Design a protein around this nucleic acid. Structure first.
Ligand SMILES: Nc1ncnc2c1ncn2[C@@H]1O[C@H](COP(=O)(O)OP(=O)(O)O)[C@@H](O)[C@H]1O
Ligand SMILES: Nc1ncnc2c1ncn2[C@@H]1O[C@H](COP(=O)(O)OP(=O)(O)O)[C@@H](O)[C@H]1O
Ligand code: VO4
Ligand code: VO4
Ligand SMILES: [Mg+2]
Ligand SMILES: [Mg+2]
Ligand SMILES: [Mg+2]
Ligand SMILES: [Mg+2]
Ligand SMILES: [Mg+2]
Ligand SMILES: [Mg+2]
Ligand SMILES: [Mg+2]
Ligand SMILES: [Mg+2]
Ligand SMILES: [Mg+2]
Ligand SMILES: [Mg+2]
Ligand SMILES: [Mg+2]
Ligand SMILES: [Zn+2]
Lengths: 48, 552, 230
RNA sequence: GGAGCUUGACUGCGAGACUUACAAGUCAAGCAGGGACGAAAGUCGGGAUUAGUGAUCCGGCACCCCCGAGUGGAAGGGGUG
RNA sequence: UCGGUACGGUUUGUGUAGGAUAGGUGGGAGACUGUGAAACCUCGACGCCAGUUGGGGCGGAGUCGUUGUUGAAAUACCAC
């Protein structure tokens, strides 16, 4: 019900993050503005 | 010599499996039909095969030298023009190139000298490679087969269930190879579907048609692909092969549970018994039991909530009355000289081909669209409940418990106090399905919260606006036997020749012809006895040749 | 189906693969049977015309011509019209000739048009495209050198192109030429087919080839013959 | 308790300590990169605190392109998540 | 006997415009030597959009058939 999800980047697709969300409250993929060390600057992140 | 295949693909939404260990293949020219109950994953299969949805755990894979087309169950027809919406795909591979011919139209010598040959020269060949040189001479030949609206009609709101005549004219003009389509016989007539049973019957290419009616699938498909709880099964037959094969699978699996629960009684009282003197309770029969009580939980489960319509207040001697009505639009006058009184304790069926004005007749009765001439006498002995074709009461951003219950906890339905969560559970949405949004739902679950929020006032005159669509043969009977035991006067618009043959007493037909496209005919009698009247009130058994979508 | 046609078919065995040394002789058994006229050479390719990298469309300059009037339509003014009428073109016009194309008069074979007279040509080519009378720079018609290209159409730079059903269709001229004058035209086309093998031709490239006349039967040739036609 | 924007429920580290047979567990000011909020001062490396977890082995995946069994590659191995 | 494959013979494709196009493409100015005319035989399988060509009775008594024709193209006959 809370699966582990992972936040790939949106410029370069590195799978930089991993966390949990509630699958029935949020049936769509999370978008957050997290850091990316490949790029060295904040970018967007969707799920996989 | 294959056109689509899957490896060991498994796909799930929630803890509700849609596929698990599904390996199957598809030949070119395989008239595949897809069946199954509502919510069983007919389109979640078909989204992946179109390439939009990725599987979870497996490999979905199209063949290389081929192409795909898709008709979703609500085609997202963008709103520019109808003659737009036949070349912006279909000939959409050519419009991206025929904007360059307009640039090089009058052929000046300015700014290009060696592109006088090579850049313009590919346009000389791609106007003869695909043999799409004119693009607007056989485009009229295409739209004179779907019987489309005229070319200068901007689809801002004016198309009802004739959106789908345009979207069929898109991807059948693409001429694809993998031809995927969710429910073509939705919203169509008994002359456009009867056309589509020949264009898909002399068609090079591979077809997977997801459908629910018994009679489209008998003439189109040649194999069946069902979808049970996760598991697929290919067949060889018709739709009646599926209903006998589904009945025996649920029976002989039901007989397993009527054996496994029996030997679960003795393996429980044996565990409940105390141990004797020196002996030991054998620890390989507690592992035998505590494992066996896990195949007594996940195996047996089912649910099917019957549709029931609430009962409203007492209906008087008048229901609604319409005398010499005139209504159309600017030049397009679709109702002339119609007079009828709507009966008491019956079922009224509205029969007419598409684009004639069946939905607008209920706009006048509910009162969202005032007529031109005539009079609509209503009476104060009637309270209105109106389910609609557009399903606009459903908001695609909020979930099932707010789409119908408006966020609060006890709703008024029959002027009574029935709780919200217990009311939506009467339509199948229970437990985990109270938290899911409204675009996520199926086409059946879309057409069942439609009845949840519009049969909420619970009046005594209900207007069914295409209820026979997007739902299987098990909930269709739950609506066929919920308005035969209704106190009075449900009115239904339907194209389904075997839904009005069983529940109808009052035909509201349309015998319009060339000199006036506005004649309507009132009748008292069931649909099956109306037809022998029409063979002798109109011409002698005259109430066709195919229209080729392209000559090449 | 004719009584004289089956006797021509009796003189060619179906089973035995033939050579250009022999197909010239079997042309003579058909030139003494039928009209000595254009001889068709068909090639079934091992390609797929769906893709762009497997789309085969080539050219060949034959060493003996083609046995045809080779009429050239020239749209030119000034000295470009004078330099093309002295090269073999019998149809020499301008933008005024565009009005005579749509009047039911298409009595020409090729249309080598100058870029300067391209005012109303791209719209009248729509009745030329599927009728095959359309110009093309890859055919050598829409080009800045409209002088030497007229004698090349006289010289037989006829263009072949694989259709949708994976078939090459190209000619080797009249039977009025000699027997080895056939193989000079015959070997030149296949030498341009093999150069136009695509980058991704899976399997064997030239799977079948045949030769036939106007109203005569076909001739099974050997695809292994690629170097020593004569 | 309420409201407005937001993603620090970060990446590279971490002096010094608590607890501790070992393995573990815990706290951490402060430094930089790149942010959020604030007029600034500053606070933010999840939640008022303390539970919501499981060593090693062997495997899966994504990326870094480290070794490549004569050499060029590859198979396989390895590294950071 | 029922199948897979490779070669070869015959055959099917019917909106709207005219003889409802015998499909695609290249070639094409002619074709058959025969009543193309009719019958108990009607491409009795095609069969509806139907006259597309024969289970073929005429039995050298000999016409049809490029038809330049409005259409996107039409016509023989043959080849891929
Ligand atoms: N994105 C989603 N998230 C969660 N559940 C979904 C989603 N899409 C569909 N479902 C549920 O899973 C089932 C699959 O839908 P499906 O049956 O494939 O639609 P259709 O009836 O058109 O085939 C539906 O009953 C629906 O309730
Ligand atoms: N908003 C509108 N404005 C003008 N005309 C409309 C509008 N909505 C529908 N129509 C016309 O109504 C006619 C058919 O009514 P419709 O509701 O589509 O009947 P049905 O529901 O039986 O198909 C169509 O000709 C359409 O042009
Ligand atoms: O838009 V309808 O013809 O299904 O009433
Ligand atoms: O495939 V459906 O259950 O949306 O008719
Ligand atoms: Mg939320
Ligand atoms: Mg409608
Ligand atoms: Mg569906
Ligand atoms: Mg975390
Ligand atoms: Mg430290
Ligand atoms: Mg900082
Ligand atoms: Mg600021
Ligand atoms: Mg800190
Ligand atoms: Mg071990
Ligand atoms: Mg090595
Ligand atoms: Mg490796
Ligand atoms: Zn990045």
């Amino acid at each position: 019900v809370r699966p582990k999800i992972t936040l790939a980047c949106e410029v370069c697709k590195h799978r930089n993050y991993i966390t949990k969300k509630n699958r029935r409250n949020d049936p769509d993929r999370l978008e957050l503005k997290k850091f990316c060390p490949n790029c060295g600057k904040h970018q967007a992140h969707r799920e996989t | 010599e294959f056109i689509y295949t899957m490896k060991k693909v498994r796909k799930a939404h929630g803890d509700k499996v849609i596929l698990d260990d599904v390996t199957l293949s598809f030949y070119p020219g395989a008239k595949i039909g897809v069946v199954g109950p509502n919510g069983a994953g007919k389109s979640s299969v078909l989204r992946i095969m179109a390439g939009l949805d990725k599987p979870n755990n497996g490999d979905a894979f199209l063949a290389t030298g081929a192409t795909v087309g898709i008709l979703q169950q609500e085609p997202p027809l963008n709103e520019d023009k109808t003659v737009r919406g036949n070349v912006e795909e279909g000939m959409g591979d050519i419009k991206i190139k025929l904007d360059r011919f307009n640039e090089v139209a009058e052929l000046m010598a300015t700014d290009y000298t060696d592109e006088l040959m090579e850049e313009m020269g590919r346009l000389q060949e791609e106007l003869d490679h695909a043999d799409a040189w004119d693009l607007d001479a056989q485009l009229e030949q295409a739209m004179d087969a779907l019987r489309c609206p005229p070319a200068d009609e901007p689809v801002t709101n004016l198309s009802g269930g004739e959106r789908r005549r345009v979207a069929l004219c898109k991807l059948l003009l693409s001429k694809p190879d993998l031809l995927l389509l969710d429910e073509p016989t939705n919203h169509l007539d008994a002359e456009s579907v009867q056309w589509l049973e020949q264009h898909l019957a002399s068609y090079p290419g591979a077809i997977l048609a997801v459908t629910h009616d018994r009679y489209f699938l008998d003439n189109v498909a040649e194999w069946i692909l069902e979808l049970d709880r996760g598991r697929a099964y290919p067949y060889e037959g018709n739709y009646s092969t599926y209903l006998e094969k589904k009945a025996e699978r649920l029976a002989v699996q039901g007989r397993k549970d009527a054996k496994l629960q029996k030997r679960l009684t003795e393996e429980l009282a044996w565990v409940r018994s105390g141990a004797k003197a020196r002996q030991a309770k054998s620890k390989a029969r507690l592992q035998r039991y505590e494992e066996m009580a896990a195949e007594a939980e996940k195996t047996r489960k089912l649910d099917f909530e019957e549709i029931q319509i609430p009962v409203g207040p007492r209906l008087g001697n008048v229901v609604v009355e319409v005398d010499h009505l005139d209504k159309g639009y600017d030049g397009r006058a679709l109702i002339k000289d119609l007079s009828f009184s709507l009966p008491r304790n019956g079922i009224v069926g509205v029969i007419g081909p598409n684009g004639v004005g069946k939905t607008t007749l209920f706009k006048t009765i509910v009162g969202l669209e005032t007529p031109d001439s005539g009079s609509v006498k209503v009476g104060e002995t009637v309270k209105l409940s109106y389910v609609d074709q557009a399903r606009a009461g459903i908001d695609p951003r909020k979930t099932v418990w707010e789409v119908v219950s408006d966020g609060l906890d006890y709703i008024q339905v029959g002027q009574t106090e029935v709780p919200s969560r217990a009311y939506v559970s009467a339509f199948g949405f229970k437990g985990p399905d109270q938290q899911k949004p409204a675009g996520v739902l199926s086409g059946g679950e879309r057409n069942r919260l439609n009845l949840a929020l519009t049969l909420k006032q619970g009046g005594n005159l209900i207007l069914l606006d295409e209820p026979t669509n997007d739902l299987d043969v098990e909930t269709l009977g739950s609506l066929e036997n919920a308005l035969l035991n209704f106190p009075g006067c449900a009115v239904v618009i339907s194209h389904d020749r075997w839904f009005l043959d069983r529940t109808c007493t009052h035909i509201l037909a349309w015998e319009g012809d060339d000199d006036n496209e506005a004649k309507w005919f009132w009748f008292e009698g069931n649909f099956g006895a109306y037809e022998e009247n029409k063979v002798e009130r109109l011409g002698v058994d005259a109430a066709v040749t195919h229209r080729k979508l392209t000559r090449g | 189906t004719s009584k004289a046609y089956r006797a021509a078919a009796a003189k060619v065995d179906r089973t035995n693969l033939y050579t250009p040394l022999q197909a010239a002789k079997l042309a003579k058994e058909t030139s003494s049977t039928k009209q000595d006229a254009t001889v068709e050479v068909a090639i079934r390719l091992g390609v797929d015309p769906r893709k762009a990298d497997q789309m085969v469309r080539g050219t060949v300059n034959l060493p003996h011509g083609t046995g045809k009037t080779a009429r050239v339509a020239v749209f030119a003014v000034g000295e470009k019209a004078d330099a093309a009428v002295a090269a073999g073109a019998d149809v020499v016009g301008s933008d005024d000739l565009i009005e005579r194309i749509q009047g039911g008069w298409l009595e020409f074979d090729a249309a080598i048009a100058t870029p300067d007279q391209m005012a109303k040509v791209g719209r009248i080519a729509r009745v030329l495209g599927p009728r095959g009378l359309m110009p093309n720079p890859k055919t050598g018609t829409v080009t800045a050198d409209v002088a030497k290209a007229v004698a090349d159409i006289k010289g037989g730079k006829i263009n072949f192109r694989v259709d949708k059903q994976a078939n090459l269709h190209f000619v080797i001229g009249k039977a009025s030429f000699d027997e080895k004058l056939l193989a000079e035209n015959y070997g030149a086309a296949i030498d341009e087919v093999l150069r136009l093998k695509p980058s991704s031709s899976k399997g064997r490239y030239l799977k079948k080839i045949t030769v036939s006349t106007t109203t005569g039967p076909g001739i099974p040739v050997d695809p292994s013959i690629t170097r020593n036609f004569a």
